[PDB]
């Protein structure tokens, strides 16, 4: 259980690091899908079975499909992206990487000073999640429907062709 957690976390970290430094958009999206599968494995190792199932079903099965679809529609041949490699220049990324490293050290220092009895990994099913969802979290469900409706209306208004 822990062994799967560490391997899946390492795979997610390495795949995301491959994502943010890659030039090909389809390869970057493939590495992102791999990282999402690894994060789903992390979810399954922690007992969040519904979260891992939705991580593959929706995040790696709908949202990344939309990203891949849009990349095909653009026909991205790396025009002025691969031919420049501006993010690979050390003078470009040395600043933001140092900033992200400083923020990571601050967050990790805050994390390490918290009480931790360990995660038991007892499986929390989708039945309990649905009980909470339509019990104490009813208005979250209905206003999330309104949020998805707003996203639908906005994306239809903007993404037409005429």
């Amino acid at each position: 259980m822990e062994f799967a957690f560490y391997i899946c976390g390492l795979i997610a970290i390495l795949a995301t690091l491959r994502v943010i430094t890659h030039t090909n958009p389809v390869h970057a999206l493939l590495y992102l899908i791999i990282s999402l599968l690894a994060i789903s494995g992390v979810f399954f190792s922690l007992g969040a079975y519904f979260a891992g199932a939705l991580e593959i079903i929706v995040y790696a099965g709908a949202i990344m499909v939309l990203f891949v679809f849009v990349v095909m529609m653009l026909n991205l041949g790396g025009s002025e992206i691969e031919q420049e490699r501006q993010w690979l220049k050390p003078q470009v990324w040395i600043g933001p990487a140092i900033l992200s490293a400083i923020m990571l050290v601050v967050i990790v220092y805050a994390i390490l000073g918290v009480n931790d009895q360990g995660i038991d990994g007892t499986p929390i099913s989708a039945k309990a999640v649905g009980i909470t969802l339509f019990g104490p979290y009813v208005l979250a469900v209905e206003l999330a429907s309104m949020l998805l409706l707003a996203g639908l209306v906005v994306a239809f208004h903007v993404g037409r062709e005429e």
Partner: peptide, 24 residues
């Protein structure tokens, strides 16, 4: 598994990538 047909839906949502990747 306790997810079952959720695992089936996982597999089908991954299976659309075969067509997308073959075309691209």
């Amino acid at each position: 598994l306790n997810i079952g047909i959720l695992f089936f839906l996982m597999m089908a949502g991954l299976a659309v990538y075969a067509v997308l990747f073959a075309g691209w």
